[PDB]
Each structure stands twice: as structure tokens, then as C-alpha cells.
Design a protein around this ligand. Structure first.
Ligand code: CLA
Ligand code: CLA
Ligand code: CLA
Ligand code: CLA
Ligand code: CLA
Ligand code: CLA
Ligand code: CLA
Ligand code: CLA
Ligand code: CLA
Ligand code: PQN
Ligand code: SF4
Ligand code: SF4
Lengths: 734, 150, 39, 31
């Protein structure tokens, strides 16, 4: 009964699959044998503690390592050229030119290049010396340890929180949305005006001199008199250099807007004023609900309002809402799905507000770093959402009561799901058919030698929104292109600098477009459309199908329902998840390559290739597929090596595991068992080796496990090669 | 007070460096100074439609007429500290006496018949040792002595 | 190299090899334990 | 600049506080 103890059942089987199933449930708690709610709640408390602790450990790891054997200061002196340092290199199996192609930045040992980009962000926060981050590591380490101990304490009996202490929401609401970051952004603002801005202006403010010197010479005057423009004193000059005082300034909260003419990034005073704004805004948002004290908004009863002004309601916006607000407090998969969806969305938005609004210095010039970060974050984002949809699906089977929601809005959704999925299939079919037809149009027409017989569309809605934001390139004189309209005296109170910036579209700020962008954007539309299609199909079948309604009781599990009608394989409520994962991978590949080609053409300004060969797909696979790989493919060859051999190895390794995935996917478990029989027959009857016997009787794999391993191999094969390609290309072409 | 008499002894003991004014061991009531300051520059921003400060003891110019002062800014150095603190001291003890008579008016831990007997009466015999002056208006007697001092 | 000592020369193998060794050995003998005790 | 035996130091702060603290937080849940 020892392993696995958390399930007395699974420890009653002499087949190796035990081990396989032993390590695929240890993190599915509510399926263990004999643990009611509060046990789960308290141990989840502790385990979440441990998670944030190991996050802190990770941060300390990277920061201490760069503090040890890096060139952060040698990156201070010559910033725009000196390359950062990851860590040391130590492998006896290594090559020959490795040490010969590694030691740079004055180093004599095999340094490893760094790409994530902590140097820029950290110096932006105002670090100067190794000792700074040395001590930084030293103390957030003890912070992590103390947090670990805190996690341990609440395990003791006298320190066991109550289930009601978990259900009560409004205190957590207020404490978080006001006292988690509002006050924390206030503290960050204090660190900004006390440390960050001085270090930007070249003055060193340590841990002792900060007690006696001022943020502003006019300091404490508008403190309690109310002339806050005084702190908006002389701003930084048109020639200031960070870390220096050449044309310095003495303004704390400015609203300059646009960019800084040297770092081409966001202005630091705008940042401080921004943070202050949101801080006080969340604080005033803090007392917004009702607490245990006797005022405010009772969430679980605010939307329990079915009467106002005679005409009662059906609810807010005149729709039923009664009976579900306990569910968000009943289930956990619900909150988890909401959080996952939200997080994925804002992560994508982050990934979008980077290549146009450089937050830190030197961000725009160093292509490889920002490029890797962009695709990194978007990749993180994509299946982050798939997690939300999957947990929505699993919520639909476990956490759902019928009569408690009779006739509310959810049931009215379920009553008409049919038209939803039908019209969704419709729009997918339409967009796919027509985009492919236009593509093949172009292909055949250009395949005859006459390109003028071929269609060119031209998008103008994005053109109109571009000019309407204030772009003049197209000369339409509308809404800040019309400098005399009603709104032409509004916007920022420092819109002149913003206008100088945006008119200077030389940087990555809303570049012009053409027909290709029309094409690929419709392709994106299609992609997400079919992705959400398959996902919602699986979700709304989490209960049952027309030709298999029972599955609600079969579970979010294997069910195969052997060949009743031609077969019923892949009906198990996350069969859809595999399909969705494929449909997300190809989508994100499409979009990231679009971004890559766009910015690559922007690099040397030669936009001709993109617009010229975006129509027919031959151009796609000819202009950018192999026209950048010989810069990488010959990293090693029968004649020599480079600092890229490891990246070619990356390529080939990824391809290998990719095809291994196919092997696992195609062949099925009706053939890999016959030969295991005869192969057991061997050991029984050969001599001098029949001494040993079996720990446990081996059998073939399982079906679901086979599917899972195949998918894992496929995804890992897909991940590696593309990353290697993108960073190698960016660092080899500039 | 013991701090005061400590400095007294030090001055009488040829140890003048152990005094407590500016020329010796330091203490400065920064709070009053800062509040007066933030009062000095009030007009314009806090008081736009206002011409001069509310008074001239906080800040402003020394306002006068003839060879005769009308109002100048007042200076708070070291001696202010213990003076204000002994003010607070005596007010505290006054409240102590009065509130003590207030709460222990009807029932004491020894006399459970006070309100059952009155509030203007001299004593309750030499029980428990002595009990003279256990009414309330004797509490206010002592209190009025103390407020006299204050 | 730099101002640190030999340490990055030989501290990888034990973490690379021997600690995994004892890890998996202890683990295997754990997954066969008798009843009802186990360490 | 860079460091010295002080790195043996920062190693020494570990293996008592974080080490056996995490050890206990692990073994709490009955292997
Ligand atoms: C079977 C052969 C083999 C083996 C055993 C290793 C082993 C190692 N290589 Mg290595 N390498 C190999 C082939 C191999 N490599 C080949 C073919 C190439 C390309 C020519 C490289 C290129 C290479 C580079 C460029 C680097 C390494 C590094 C490392 C070390 C990583 C630290 C570690 O073990 O973390 C263990 C972690 C887990 C098990 C997880 C490790 C000793 C890195 C290193 O030493 O940095 C400190 C490093 O920078 N290797
Ligand atoms: C066992 C292998 C190994 C390990 C554990 C690490 C560990 C680390 N590397 Mg790393 N790296 C390695 C091999 C390794 N490296 C090799 C062989 C290369 C050459 C391709 C790099 C190139 C590299 C870059 C370019 C960067 C890191 C960075 C980092 C840190 C962040 C995590 C990360 O990106 O991991 C990466 C792990 C693998 C790729 C495996 C972390 C300390 C980042 C950093 O600056 O932190 C110091 C960063 O930007 N690594
Ligand atoms: C509560 C904290 C706080 C503080 C200390 C400041 C401080 C400041 N704000 Mg301000 N602001 C805040 C919150 C805050 N803001 C919030 C929550 C909003 C709403 C989004 C604004 C919207 C705002 C605008 C729209 C403007 C300022 C401006 C200013 C500056 C001049 C103010 C002045 O003397 O009157 C000057 C009064 C007028 C010019 C009229 C000063 C640096 C002004 C500025 O940048 O300087 C001119 C300005 O135009 N603020
Ligand atoms: C912080 C985010 C987070 C958290 C806390 C969980 C937590 C959980 N997930 Mg999960 N998941 C996430 C993100 C997350 N996931 C994402 C991003 C995806 C998409 C890639 C998934 C896809 C996913 C699937 C497909 C399944 C889970 C399952 C589970 C549960 C069992 C854990 C396990 O190892 O079984 C994993 C078991 C297998 C992979 C088989 C557990 C409650 C499983 C579950 O509910 O139990 C049946 C399950 O079937 N999750
Ligand atoms: C007179 C015959 C007729 C009519 C009126 C329709 C009408 C319709 N079909 Mg349709 N269909 C037909 C014959 C017909 N079909 C035949 C013979 C086939 C077999 C090839 C199909 C295969 C088909 C598919 C696969 C789909 C439709 C869909 C649709 C709907 C969207 C509009 C449309 O025409 O897309 C027709 C699209 C194609 C012919 C391609 C619409 C109700 C789509 C829908 O969303 O239904 C609501 C959809 O997904 N139909
Ligand atoms: C070149 C590869 C390729 C192509 C052209 C398609 C084409 C299509 N797939 Mg598809 N699919 C593929 C690979 C591909 N798939 C792979 C590898 C998987 C994973 C095994 C899937 C999984 C999949 C699912 C799960 C679904 C589709 C759907 C669709 C249709 C989308 C509607 C449309 O207008 O598309 C263009 C149409 C044509 C070119 C004809 C279309 C027939 C969806 C659909 O419409 O179903 C009704 C759908 O539900 N496919
Ligand atoms: C969706 C369209 C749109 C958007 C995003 C904005 C955005 C903005 N307008 Mg605006 N505006 C618009 C349409 C729009 N306007 C139209 C159609 C009119 C005509 C009635 C105006 C008239 C207008 C005035 C009169 C002012 C703004 C101002 C502003 C700024 C302050 C926030 C605000 O009022 O909103 C902000 C940048 C204010 C501003 O920034 O002035 C300094 C301001 O005073 N707007
Ligand atoms: C499905 C995969 C799988 C897994 C995880 C195991 C796991 C195990 N087998 Mg095993 N085995 C398998 C398939 C598998 N077997 C098959 C298909 C056969 C038929 C040839 C055997 C025949 C077999 C024998 C004859 C023995 C094991 C033994 C063992 C145990 C120690 C040896 C070891 O891990 O490999 C180490 C392998 C290499 C170092 C190579 C371990 C629990 C041994 C045992 O009983 O426990 C000690 C033992 O003597 N196995
Ligand atoms: C608790 C602090 C405090 C107090 C007591 C006052 C008091 C006053 N303010 Mg004031 N003010 C304050 C904080 C304060 N302010 C702050 C923080 C700001 C910045 C927003 C202002 C901005 C302000 C303006 C812009 C004006 C006043 C004005 C006034 C006067 C209004 C007339 C009256 O009798 O009342 C009064 C003396 C008005 C006046 O005419 O003063 C004489 C006036 O125009 N105040
Ligand atoms: C190959 C294959 C198998 C056979 C796979 C098996 C038997 C598992 C492979 C045996 C193990 C995983 C090989 C690894 C052994 C390691 C070398 C030992 C690890 C020890 C080191 C860490 C020292 C299936 O059972 C199957 C089932 C359903 C659909 C497709 C397939 C399928 O494609
Ligand atoms: S895969 Fe085999 S067992 Fe599964 S449903 Fe299909 S026929 Fe039945
Ligand atoms: S205690 Fe003193 S004052 Fe009171 S009655 Fe006795 S003798 Fe008189």
C-alpha cells in the first residue's frame, strides 16, 4: 500500500503501467483517497507558497550568477556595443574552436552570451556595481527562506485557517486591488523619485545619503500648498545623457509624451506620474465594495437586484443572472479558467506593446534580444489560453448543478449552442475557401508570365484609422491630420512632441501597409476562428453528444466506445484538445513569421521583397526560407567550425524528435504487444541469463499515454528548431 | 521634572556640557517648526484669493507701528519642549483625579454604598484604617488645586 | 579565469553523476518497500 | 569589483536555513 499511497487502488497491479500512472496523478489532489475540502485548501495554500518561493530562488539564481562572472560594468562603459554575459562554460566533451570562438569582452574563460536582456532593464532601474546585485541576491534569498518557513507554520494545528476564512471574498478583493499593487506602485514611485531619477541624472544615492538629500529643491513646498506645477519644473533638456548631467533637468513629474531623443524610450518622469495615477486610482478603487464593517456594495447581492424604477428587470441589462455567483465561490476550475484567459490576453497585449514603445534604453537597436522576447512571450501566451478553455471544459463535467441554474443565462446559452457552432463553421469555411482561392488565383496567373492579370486588393480601413490617430503621410486632414477640427486642441497637453515622434515614422511606429497585410490578417482571422471552433465543440460536448449522450458520467477520461458505428475513437472530451493544440501551433507560427518578415524588411528598409512576393506562395517559400540559412547551415561542415555548430545541432535534434512524434502518433496499440510476447519468451529459455527476473511484469504502453507522449514529442520538436532559426538569423544578419 | 532637576544639578555641579539647550545636549521640536513652516507660505496656492498670511507669528514680515511692536514671528527652540510637556503632564493628572472620581462615584472596590449614601459626605468611620475624603467633590477639590497650578 | 577559486572546475560531476546515482538508487529501493513502514 | 571567499560565505548561508527548511516542508506530507 506504500506506492502509490494516495490511491489504494493503483497499488494493486503488477504491470509497469503502475509507475506510468503513479506520476500522472500526484498533482490531481481531489482525486486522492480520503481528503475533504479544508485539507485541500490548506495544502494548496502551502504549495502556492512554495511556488512563489522557488520563483524567488530562480530570480536570485540568475541575478547572483550575472553578479559573479559577467561584464555588467564593461556593459556600462560601452553600452550600445558590449554584449552581456550569461555564465561560465564547463564541459570536457567540448570542441576545439569553442574556447577559440567564445572568449570576448576581455574575458579569458569560456563566457556564454546572454540574450534575455536583464542588463538594460536593471541599469534602467539604476544599478552601478557588482556589489549592488550581490547584496540583492543575498537578501531576496533570505526573503525566500522566510517565506518558506511561513508556509511551514500554517501547517501546525493552532495555525489552520478556516474554510469561511477562504470563502469571504470582499476582504481579499479590497486588500489585493488596493493594498497589493496600488500601495506597491506607490512604493515603486518612491524608489523612482528617490533613486531611479537621480541615477538617471548621474547622482549616486546609496543606502545612507538618501536620508538627508532631497528629490527636489522645491521639495515639500507643493507638499501641502497645492502648486503641483512647481514640481513640474524645468524638464530635462534636448541634449541630456542618462547617467550624466550634460543638459540636466530638475523636474519630477512631467507629461512630455512620445520618446526621449537619446534612448528613444518612454520618459522616466512620465513613468512616475503614470504609476502615481494608477496607484491613487486603485486606492480610490479599493473601498469600492462592502466589507464586514457595514457600508458598500454586496457583490453576491448587488446583482441580486430584480427591481428598479417600477419596471422591475430580468437583471442588469435585462437578462437573468440569479444563482451563479455562488459557483465562482463554489468551483475552482471556474476562477482558474477566468484567470488563465485574462492572463493570456494581457500577455499578448504586452507582446504587442513592446516593438513600438521601447520601455528601456537601447531596446530598439539590439534586434536579437527584443525579437526573441517577442516570440517567447507570444508562444507563452498561445497555449496559456488553451489552458483556460480546457479548464472551462473540465469545469463543465465536475462543477455544475442543474436545478440551481434552471432558466438563468447559462441555460439560455446552452439552448441555442447549435446556431453558434453552425455559423462558426460557416465563417471558417467561407474565409478559408476565399483566401485560398485568391492565393491560387495569383499563383496560376503569375505562372503564365503575365502578372497584370492578377488581383491586388488594397486595405483602407487601417489607413483611415492611421491618419485619424494623427498620421499625415496620407494627407486626409482628419482628426489631428486636420489641425483645425474640434478635437484638434486636445489629447495630451504635450502632443507636440508626440507629433514630432509619430510624424517621424522612421522608427517602428505604425508603418504603412499593402495588399499582403490584408491577406495574412484574414488568415489570422481564419486561424483563431477554427481554433475557438474546435475548443467550444469539445467544451459543449463535455456533457454528451447526440450519438453518445452518456459521456457525462464516463468522465473527462478515455472513453472510446468501440466500433458501434464505423468506430467512435477520439470522442473523449479532450481529443479536441490535441486538435486545438495543432491549430494553435500553426497559427502562432504564421503570425510570428509575419512579424519577422515585416521587421526584417524594415531593418535595411528594403521593403520591396515583402510587397513583391507576398501574393503567391512560391515567393513566400523562396525569399525568406533558404535565403537566410546558409548564414547558419555551415556552422559546422567537413572544413571548419564557428560559434553556431550548437545551433545546427539544435535544428537537427528538433527534427529528429519531430519525426519520433509521428512514429508515436501513427502506429497504435494492437501491434506493439504481439512481439512483446515472443520477446518475453526469450529470457525464460536462454541459459546463463535466466538468473535475473522481473521487478514487475512489463507490458505495452497505454492508449491515452501514447497519445500524450506523441503530442509531447511533436510539440518539443516544433519548439526548438524555430527558436534556433530565429535567433541565429537575427544575430547573423542584423 | 526629574530631567529638569538633573540639568539643575549639572549646572550647579560645574558640568555645564550636560545642560540641554542648543549650546549643549540637543532636542528640537521639529513638528511645530514644520507645521509653522507649511503655514508660512500658505497664500497663493492654498489661499489664492488671499493676500497676506493669517498671522505674523508663524511667518511673514515683522509688522509694527512706531517704536512699538505689533507682531513678530515667534521662535521655538529647546525650552519649549519641557514646558509643553509639563503642561500635558498636569492636564493628565487633572483628568486622572476628575475621571477617577467620575468612575468610582457609585461603587468602589471597598465602598459599595456610595451612591446608596450620597456624594457630599465626609467619611465612613475609621474602618479599613481610614476612609476620610472618599466622596467626589473632594476629588474635585484636589483637581481644582491642580488646575490652579496648571 | 577570474577572482574566484577552482570551484567551477570540479563541482559539476558529483551533481552531474553521483547525486543522480544515489537519487535513483534510493528511489528504486523506495518503490519496492514492505508494509506498513517506509523511508 | 568581483568577489572572494565571501562566495563560500554566501554558500554557507544555505544548507541550514533554506536547506532543512525546505526539507521539512517536503517531508511534512508523508512520503
Ligand atoms: C554526450 C555528449 C555531451 C555531454 C555529456 C555534454 C554535457 C554538457 N555540456 Mg555539452 N555539447 C555537446 C555534447 C555533450 N555535452 C555537443 C555535441 C556540443 C556541440 C559541439 C556541446 C556544446 C556545449 C555548449 C556550448 C555548452 C555545453 C554545456 C554542457 C554542460 C551543461 C551543464 C550540465 O550538465 O547541466 C545538467 C543539466 C541537466 C541534466 C538538466 C554539460 C557538462 C554548457 C556548459 O558547460 O555550461 C556550463 C555549455 O555552455 N555543451
Ligand atoms: C545545462 C545547460 C544550461 C543551463 C542550466 C543554463 C542556465 C541558464 N541560462 Mg543558458 N545556455 C546554455 C546552457 C545552459 N544555460 C548554452 C549551451 C547556451 C548557448 C546556446 C546558453 C545560452 C544562454 C543565453 C543566451 C541566455 C542563457 C540564460 C540562462 C539563465 C536563464 C535560464 C535560461 O535561459 O536557460 C537556458 C537553458 C538552455 C538553453 C538549455 C540560466 C542561468 C539567460 C541569461 O542571461 O541568464 C544568465 C540568457 O539570456 N543561456
Ligand atoms: C494625486 C496625485 C497627483 C499629483 C501630485 C499630480 C501632479 C501634477 N499634475 Mg496631475 N493628475 C492626477 C494626479 C496627480 N497629479 C490624476 C489622477 C489625473 C487624472 C488622470 C491628473 C491629470 C492631470 C492633467 C491633465 C494635468 C496634470 C498636471 C499636473 C502637474 C501640475 C499641476 C498643477 O500645479 O496645476 C496645473 C493646472 C493646470 C495646468 C490646469 C503636477 C506635476 C498638469 C501638468 O502636466 O502640468 C501643466 C496637467 O496638464 N495632471
Ligand atoms: C497554473 C496553471 C495550471 C494549473 C494550476 C493546472 C492544474 C491542473 N491541471 Mg492543467 N493545464 C494548464 C495549466 C494549469 N493546470 C494549461 C496551461 C494547460 C494547457 C496546456 C492545461 C491542460 C490540462 C489538461 C489537459 C489536464 C489538466 C489537468 C490538471 C489537474 C491535474 C494536474 C496534472 O498534472 O494532471 C495532468 C494530467 C494529464 C496531462 C493527463 C490540475 C488541477 C488534468 C485534469 O484535470 O485531471 C484529469 C487534465 O486532464 N490540465
Ligand atoms: C440547393 C442546395 C443547397 C443549399 C441551398 C445549401 C445551403 C447551405 N449550405 Mg450546403 N451543401 C449542399 C447543397 C446546398 N447547400 C451540398 C450538395 C453539399 C455537399 C458538398 C453541401 C455542403 C455544405 C457544407 C459542408 C456546408 C454547407 C453550408 C450551407 C449553408 C451556408 C450557405 C451555403 O450555401 O454554403 C454552402 C457551402 C458549400 C457548398 C461549400 C446554407 C444553409 C455551410 C454552413 O455553415 O451551413 C449552415 C457548411 O458548412 N453546405
Ligand atoms: C494543409 C493542411 C490542412 C488544410 C488545408 C486543412 C483544411 C481544413 N481543415 Mg484541417 N487539419 C489539419 C490540416 C489541414 N486542414 C491537421 C493537420 C489537423 C490536425 C489533425 C486538422 C484538424 C482540423 C479540425 C479539427 C478541423 C479542421 C477544419 C478544417 C477546414 C477549415 C475550413 C476552411 O475554410 O479551410 C479551408 C478549406 C479548404 C482548403 C477546403 C478545412 C477543410 C475545421 C472544419 O472546417 O471542420 C468542419 C475543423 O473542425 N481541421
Ligand atoms: C474614440 C475617439 C476619441 C478618443 C480616444 C479621444 C481621446 C481623448 N480626447 Mg477626445 N474627442 C473626440 C474623440 C475622441 N477623443 C471627439 C469626437 C471630440 C469632439 C466632441 C473630442 C473632443 C475632445 C475635447 C474637447 C477634449 C478631448 C480630450 C481628449 C483626451 C482626454 C481624454 C478624453 O476626453 O477622452 C484623450 C486623448 C481632452 C484633452 O486631451 O484636452 C487637453 C479635451 O479637452 N477630446
Ligand atoms: C516499459 C518499460 C519498462 C520499464 C520502465 C522497466 C523498468 C524496470 N525493469 Mg524492465 N523490462 C521491460 C520494460 C520495462 N522495464 C521489457 C519490455 C522487458 C522484456 C525484455 C523487461 C525485462 C526486464 C528484466 C529481465 C529485468 C527488468 C528490470 C527492471 C527494473 C530495473 C531495471 C531498469 O530500470 O532498467 C535498467 C536497464 C538498463 C540499464 C539498460 C525496472 C523497474 C529488472 C528487475 O527485475 O528489477 C531490478 C530485471 O532484472 N526488466
Ligand atoms: C486641508 C487643507 C486645505 C485648506 C484648509 C484649504 C483652505 C482654503 N483653500 Mg485650498 N487647497 C488645498 C488645501 C487646503 N485648502 C490643496 C491641497 C489644494 C490643491 C488642489 C488647494 C487649492 C486651492 C485653490 C485653487 C483655491 C483654494 C482656496 C481655498 C480657500 C477657500 C475659501 C474658504 O474660506 O475655504 C481656503 C482658505 C481658494 C481661495 O480663493 O483661497 C483664498 C482657491 O481659489 N485652495
Ligand atoms: C513504440 C510504441 C510502444 C512501445 C513503447 C514502449 C514499450 C516504451 C519504451 C520503453 C522505454 C520507455 C524505453 C526507455 C528505456 C530507457 C533506456 C531506460 C531509462 C534508464 C536511464 C535513465 C538510465 C507502445 O506501447 C505504443 C502504444 C500505443 C501506441 C503507440 C505505441 C508505440 O508507438
Ligand atoms: S481506437 Fe479501437 S478501441 Fe478505441 S474507439 Fe476506435 S476501434 Fe474502439
Ligand atoms: S477618618 Fe478622620 S476625618 Fe474621617 S471621620 Fe474619622 S477622624 Fe473624622
Amino acid at each position: 500500500t506504500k506506492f502509490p499511497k494516495f490511491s489504494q487502488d493503483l497499488a494493486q497491479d503488477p504491470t509497469t503501467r503502475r509507475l506510468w500512472y503513479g506520476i500522472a496523478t500526484a498533482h490531481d489532489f481531489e482525486t486522492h483517497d480520503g481528503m475533504t475540502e479544508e485539507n485541500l485548501y490548506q495544502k494548496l495554500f502551502a504549495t502556492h507558497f512554495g511556488h512563489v518561493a522557488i520563483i524567488f530562488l530562480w530570480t536570485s539564481s540568475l541575478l547572483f550568477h550575472v553578479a559573479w562572472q559577467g561584464n555588467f560594468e564593461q556593459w556600462i562603459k560601452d553600452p550600445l556595443n558590449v554584449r552581456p554575459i550569461a555564465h561560465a562554460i564547463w564541459d570536457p566533451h567540448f570542441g576545439k574552436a569553442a574556447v577559440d570562438a567564445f572568449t570576448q569582452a576581455g574575458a579569458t574563460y569560456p563566457v556564454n552570451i546572454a540574450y534575455s536582456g536583464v542588463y538594460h532593464w536593471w541599469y534602467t532601474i539604476g544599478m552601478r556595481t557588482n556589489n549592488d546585485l550581490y547584496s540583492g541576491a543575498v537578501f531576496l534569498l533570505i526573503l525566500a527562506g522566510v517565506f518558506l518557513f511561513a508556509g511551514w507554520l500554517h501547517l501546525q494545528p493552532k495555525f489552520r485557517p478556516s474554510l469561511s476564512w477562504f470563502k469571504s471574498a470582499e476582504p481579499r478583493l479590497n486588500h489585493h486591488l488596493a493594498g497589493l499593487f496600488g500601495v506597491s506602485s506607490l512604493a515603486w514611485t518612491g524608489h523612482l523619485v528617490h533613486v531611479a531619477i537621480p541615477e538617471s541624472r548621474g547622482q549616486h544615492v546609496g543606502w545612507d545619503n538618501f536620508l538627508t538629500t532631497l528629490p527636489h529643491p522645491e521639495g515639500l513646498r507643493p507638499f501641502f500648498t497645492g502648486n503641483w506645477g512647481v514640481y513640474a519644473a524645468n524638464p530635462d533638456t534636448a541634449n541630456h545623457v542618462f547617467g550624466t548631467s550634460q543638459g540636466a533637468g530638475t523636474a519630477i513629474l512631467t507629461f512630455l509624451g512620445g520618446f526621449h531623443p537619446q534612448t528613444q524610450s518612454l520618459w522616466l518622469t512620465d513613468m512616475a506620474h503614470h504609476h502615481l495615477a494608477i496607484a491613487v486610482l486603485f486606492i480610490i478603487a479599493g473601498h469600492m465594495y462592502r466589507t464586514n464593517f457595514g457600508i458598500g456594495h454586496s457583490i453576491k447581492e448587488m446583482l441580486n437586484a430584480k427591481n428598479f424604477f417600477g419596471t422591475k428587470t430580468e437583471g442588469q441589462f435585462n437578462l437573468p443572472h440569479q444563482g451563479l455567483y455562488d459557483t465562482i465561490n463554489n468551483s475552482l476550475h471556474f476562477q482558474l479558467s477566468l484567470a488563465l484567459a485574462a492572463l493570456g490576453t494581457i500577455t499578448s497585449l504586452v507582446a504587442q506593446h513592446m516593438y513600438a514603445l521601447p520601455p528601456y534604453a537601447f531596446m530598439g537597436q539590439d534586434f536579437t534580444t527584443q525579437a526573441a522576447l517577442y516570440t517567447h512571450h507570444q508562444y507563452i501566451a498561445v497555449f496559456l489560453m488553451v489552458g483556460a478553455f480546457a479548464h472551462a471544459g473540465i469545469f463543465w463535467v465536475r462543477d455544475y448543478d442543474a436545478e440551481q441554474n434552471k432558466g438563468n443565462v447559462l441555460d439560455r446559452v446552452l439552448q441555442h449552442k447549435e446556431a453558434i457552432i453552425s455559423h462558426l463553421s460557416w465563417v471558417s469555411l467561407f474565409l478559408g475557401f476565399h483566401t485560398l482561392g485568391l492565393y491560387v488565383h495569383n499563383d496560376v496567373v503569375v505562372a503564365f508570365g503575365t502578372p497584370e492579370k492578377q488581383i491586388l486588393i488594397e486595405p483602407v480601413f487601417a489607413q483611415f484609422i492611421q491618419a485619424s490617430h494623427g498620421k499625415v503621410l496620407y494627407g486626409l486632414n482628419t482628426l489631428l491630420s486636420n489641425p483645425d477640427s474640434v478635437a484638434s486642441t486636445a489629447g495630451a497637453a504635450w502632443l507636440p512632441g508626440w507629433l514630432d515622434a509619430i510624424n517621424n515614422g522612421t522608427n517602428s511606429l505604425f508603418l504603412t501597409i499593402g495588399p499582403g497585410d490584408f491577406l495574412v490578417h484574414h488568415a489570422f482571422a481564419l486561424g483563431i476562428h477554427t481554433t475557438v471552433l474546435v475548443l467550444v465543440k469539445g467544451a459543449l460536448d463535455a456533457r454528451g453528444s447526440k450519438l453518445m449522450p452518456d459521456k457525462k458520467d464516463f468522465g473527462y477520461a478515455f472513453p472510446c466506445d468501440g466500433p458501434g458505428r464505423g468506430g467512435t475513437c477520439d470522442i473523449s472530451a479532450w481529443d479536441a484538445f490535441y486538435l486545438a493544440l495543432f491549430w494553435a501551433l500553426n497559427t502562432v507560427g504564421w503570425v510570428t513569421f509575419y512579424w519577422h518578415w515585416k521587421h526584417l524588411g524594415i531593418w535595411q528598409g528594403n521593403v520591396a521583397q515583402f510587397n513583391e512576393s507576398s501574393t503567391y506562395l512560391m515567393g513566400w517559400l523562396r525569399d525568406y526560407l533558404w535565403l537566410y540559412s546558409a548564414q547558419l547551415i555551415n556552422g559546422y561542415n567537413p572544413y571548419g567550425m564557428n560559434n553556431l555548430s550548437v545551433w545546427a545541432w539544435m535544428f537537427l535534434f528538433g527534427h529528429l524528435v519531430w519525426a519520433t512524434g509521428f512514429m508515436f502518433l501513427i502506429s497504435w496499440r494492437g501491434y506493439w504487444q504481439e512481439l512483446i510476447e515472443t520477446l518475453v519468451w526469450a529470457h525464460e529459455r536462454t541459459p546463463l541469463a535466466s538468473l535475473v527476473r522481473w521487478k514487475d511484469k512489463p507490458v505495452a504502453m497505454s492508449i491515452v499515454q501514447g497519445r500524450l507522449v506523441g503530442l509531447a514529442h511533436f510539440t518539443v520538436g516544433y519548439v526548438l528548431t524555430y527558436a534556433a532559426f530565429v535567433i541565429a538569423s537575427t544575430a547573423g544578419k542584423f | 521634572f526629574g530631567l529638569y532637576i538633573h540639568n539643575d544639578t549639572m549646572q550647579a555641579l560645574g558640568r555645564p556640557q550636560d545642560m540641554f539647550s542648543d549650546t549643549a545636549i540637543q532636542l528640537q521640536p521639529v513638528f511645530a517648526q514644520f507645521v509653522q513652516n507649511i503655514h508660512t507660505l500658505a497664500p497663493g496656492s492654498t489661499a489664492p484669493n488671499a493676500l497676506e498670511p493669517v498671522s505674523y507669528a508663524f511667518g511673514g514680515g515683522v509688522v509694527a507701528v512706531g517704536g512699538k511692536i505689533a507682531m513678530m514671528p515667534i521662535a521655538l527652540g529647546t525650552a519649549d519642549f519641557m514646558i509643553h510637556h509639563i503642561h500635558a503632564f498636569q492636564i493628565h493628572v487633572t483628568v486622572l483625579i476628575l475621571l477617577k472620581g467620575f468612575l468610582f462615584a457609585r461603587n468602589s472596590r471597598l465602598i459599595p454604598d456610595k451612591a446608596n449614601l450620597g456624594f457630599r459626605f465626609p467619611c465612613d468611620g475609621p474602618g479599613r484604617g481610614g476612609t476620610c475624603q472618599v466622596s467626589g467633590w473632594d476629588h474635585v477639590f484636589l483637581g481644582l488645586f491642580w488646575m490652579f497650578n496648571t | 579565469m577570474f577572482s574566484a577559486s577552482f570551484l567551477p572546475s570540479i563541482l559539476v560531476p558529483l551533481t552531474g553523476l553521483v547525486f543522480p546515482a544515489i537519487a535513483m538508487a534510493l528511489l528504486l529501493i523506495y518503490v519496492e518497500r514492505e508494509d506498513p513502514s517506509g523511508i | 569589483m568581483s568577489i572572494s571567499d565571501t562566495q563560500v560565505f554566501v554558500a554557507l548561508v544555505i544548507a541550514l536555513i533554506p536547506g532543512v527548511l525546505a526539507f521539512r516542508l517536503a517531508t511534512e506530507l508523508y512520503k
